[PDB]
From a paper:
We analysed a multidomain xylanase (Xyl) from the hindgut metagenome of the snouted harvester termite Trinervitermes trinervoides that releases xylobiose and xylotriose from beech and birch xylan and wheat arabinoxylan. The four domains of Xyl include an N-terminal GH11 xylanase domain, two family 36-like carbohydrate-binding domains CBM36-1 and 2, and a C-terminal CE4 esterase domain.
Single crystals were obtained after three months using 10 mg/ml protein in 50 mM Na acetate pH 4.8, 0.5 M (NH4)2SO4 at 18°C. Diffraction data were collected on beamline ID29 at the European Synchrotron Radiation Facility (ESRF), Grenoble, France and automatically processed. The crystal structure of the GH11-CBM36-1 construct revealed electron density only for the GH11 domain and was refined to an R-free of 0.187 with a 99.9% completeness. This structure filled in the potentially missing information from the Xyl-GH11 domain above, which had a low completeness of 87.5%. While the lack of electron density for the CBM36-1 domain could imply that the linker between the domains was degraded during crystallization, this is unlikely as GH11 would then presumably have crystallized in the same triclinic packing observed for the Xyl-GH11 domain above.
Residue numbers in the entry: 30 to 232
């Protein structure tokens, strides 16, 4: 229930992962979607809990996807706190970022704004040509919604970001996974996800 090295698994209905390329990481797996983590001397690391979806379905088929979450979030350098996931056909890596450390991701310039869940989100898109992905080295898009001001608790209605992105011409494939995610880059920090209730279904 405390992880220190790369591991993926499932507990209490939530898929979890700790991953780092190097450095010190720890992750306490608490009930349900909740977890606690710390990192130092890392290059890249991530800690996440959510779901790898069991079918090959669109978000209209899966039903509502939302995270009712709360995190006591103390990054010491580069870091962000987000919902993270992928779609396939088309292949998309997506991010809904609510807070960050020293650097607000992803860089570049937004193409729109979404007013949802009491906040304003900047929308970004990238193409990454022949780069590592969940389907090997290949080309994929990245979609980002990044809050204009930091917050660390509330509801992220992922379905509404999906719908807004599609209205802005950003096609969603079948949903592969979605998880509440803490990232670190060349930094130290800690975060306690004390609440993470992931809705999957219905309207």
């Amino acid at each position: 229930t405390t992880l220190y090295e790369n591991k993926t698994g499932t507990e209490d209905g939530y898929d979890y992962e700790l991953w780092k390329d190097s450095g010190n990481t720890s992750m306490i797996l608490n009930g349900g979607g909740t977890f606690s983590c710390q990192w130092s001397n890392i290059n890249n690391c991530l800690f996440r809990k959510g779901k790898k979806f069991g079918g090959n379905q669109s978000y209209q088929q899966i039903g509502n996807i939302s995270f009712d979450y709360g995190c006591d979030y103390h990054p010491n350098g580069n870091s962000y706190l987000c919902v993270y996931g992928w779609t396939t056909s088309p292949l998309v890596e997506f991010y809904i970022v609510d807070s960050w450390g020293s650097w607000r991701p992803p860089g570049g310039s937004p193409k729109g704004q979404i007013y949802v869940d009491g906040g304003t989100y900047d929308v970004y898109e990238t193409t990454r040509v022949n780069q590592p992905s969940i389907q090997g080295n290949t080309t994929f898009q990245q979609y980002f919604s990044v809050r204009t001001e930091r917050r660390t608790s509330g509801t992220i209605n992922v379905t509404e970001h999906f719908k807004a992105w599609e209205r802005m011409g950003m096609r969603m494939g079948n949903i592969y996974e979605a998880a509440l995610n803490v990232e670190g880059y060349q930094s130290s920090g800690s975060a306690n996800v004390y609440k993470n209730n992931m809705t999957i279904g219905g309207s």
